[PDB]
Amino acid sequence: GLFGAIAGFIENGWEGMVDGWYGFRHQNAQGTGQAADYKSTQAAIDQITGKLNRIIKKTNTEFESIESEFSEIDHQIGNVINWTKDSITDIWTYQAELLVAMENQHTIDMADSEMLNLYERVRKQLRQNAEEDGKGCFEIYHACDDSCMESIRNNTYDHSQYREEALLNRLN
């Protein structure tokens, strides 16, 4: 997309991931394991929630009938009304076709961002103790157990605590 995260450098999405929108997949010594990131998944929802509230609304404007459904109204005035209406109806057709189209573009790219925003948050945690594989994973250049992994997802992982171990494995 705009942010390249979704339908971008991330090959595809995870039909398996039904506990959120944005998440992790570690594979290590102990073995594989999946988990969703709430704080990001929520931010995207909270934003769409907000979109929907504002968009899913009619006015509080009480409209009287200007057209008799049973009687026949004067041809001069009736022709004016038909035009006035058809022109209003043509605007709202447009004002909507555009609103939805634009809000759709923004919704997509907003999600796109909240992904990259995670990747970048994590990249900056892992500092020099990992490398970007280009498909939205970090090859960690140190031993990282289910303790160490949950410390990344929890944004508690400390680079200095593995820094030497990692930097050595990297230069080899």
Binding site: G13, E15, K57, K58, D90, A101
Partner: protein, 320 residues
């Protein structure tokens, strides 16, 4: 060889298609409709003090057509006119007809006040017709009197009747002019003399000459009783100058507050609530648009020329 942690987004196999500024076929996780395509076949008068008129037409209420007898007075918040609704037992039409209905439909209720008008006994104010039946007998518009001369052929006496608005809000005075089929009929009721009917108020002036000559037959009658109307302002008088052939008010109407007017063919439902109505019934959608009909009334979603506008409620769906 090296440990990994991966970043990723959810997905589904059955994802929805929406339109954006760039893509017209963009697939996403979840989406929702913004255009309501479905209607209710019913009018939703829950929490509404409404009045269904049935075959009574709004106009008829002020003049008192047989049908409208149940709807002469009352207070409401919603008026419901119906198709072929009867406003004129005796043939004719109201001058400035549409305007009147719309005024009655936007009204929230009707009071009636008596004119008090009395006439010398050279005049027959009890004048009834076959066209307006009531209890299997000839009758007339309840809120009007048919003024004809007592002795068939005698000239109708010059009379002056004047209504004063005692109330502190404006009243709606309605009256009628009678047009004779032929001069035989004209002279038998009002006499040989040519007739002139002058109505006057502070804000109204108008002269009416009844016209003789045959129309086609309607209910056995080629004669017409057309009606006119005006608002009489508080603490004001309206004066009726007539040589005869004036169908005079026994009652002025007062339109109380305001109310929502629904022209519909659908039945009522008091279980159901709404703020939007059209010919085909109620519209309840929280949605912001609709493609049912550009003729809506009340607080309503805006009519659009789109079947469906799908709004993305989730991210791009990328499948496995």
């Amino acid at each position: 060889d090296p440990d990994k942690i991966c970043l990723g987004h959810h997905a589904v196999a059955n994802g929805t298609i929406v339109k954006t500024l760039t893509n017209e076929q963009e697939e996403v996780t979840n989406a929702t409709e913004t255009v309501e395509s479905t209607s209710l076949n019913r009018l939703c008068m829950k929490g509404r003090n409404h009045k269904d008129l049935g075959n009574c037409h709004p106009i008829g209420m002020l003049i008192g057509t047989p049908a409208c007898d149940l709807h002469l007075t009352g207070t409401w918040d919603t008026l419901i006119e119906r198709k072929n609704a009867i406003a004129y037992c005796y043939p004719g039409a109201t001058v400035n007809e549409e305007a009147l209905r719309q005024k009655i439909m936007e009204s929230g209720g009707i009071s009636k006040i008596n004119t008090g008008f009395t006439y010398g006994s050279s005049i027959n104010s009890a004048g009834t017709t076959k066209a307006c039946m009531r209890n299997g007998g000839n009758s007339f518009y309840a809120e009007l009197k048919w003024l004809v001369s007592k002795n068939k052929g005698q000239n109708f006496p010059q009379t002056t009747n004047t209504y004063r608005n005692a109330d502190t809000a404006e009243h709606l005075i309605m009256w009628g002019i009678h047009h004779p089929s032929s001069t035989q009929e004209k002279n038998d009721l009002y006499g040989t003399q040519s007739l002139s009917i002058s109505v006057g108020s502070s804000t109204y002036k108008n002269n009416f000459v009844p016209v003789v000559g045959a129309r086609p037959q309607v209910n056995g009658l080629s004669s017409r009783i057309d009606f006119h109307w005006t608002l009489v302002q508080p603490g004001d008088k309206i004066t009726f100058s007539h040589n005869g052939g004036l169908i005079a008010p026994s009652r002025v109407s007062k339109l109380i507050g305001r109310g929502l007017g629904i022209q519909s063919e659908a039945p009522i439902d008091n279980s159901c609530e709404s703020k939007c109505f059209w010919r085909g019934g109620s519209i309840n959608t929280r949605l912001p648009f609709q493609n049912l009909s550009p003729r809506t009334v009340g607080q309503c979603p805006k009519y659009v020329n789109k079947k469906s506008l799908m709004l993305a409620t989730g991210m791009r769906n990328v499948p496995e």
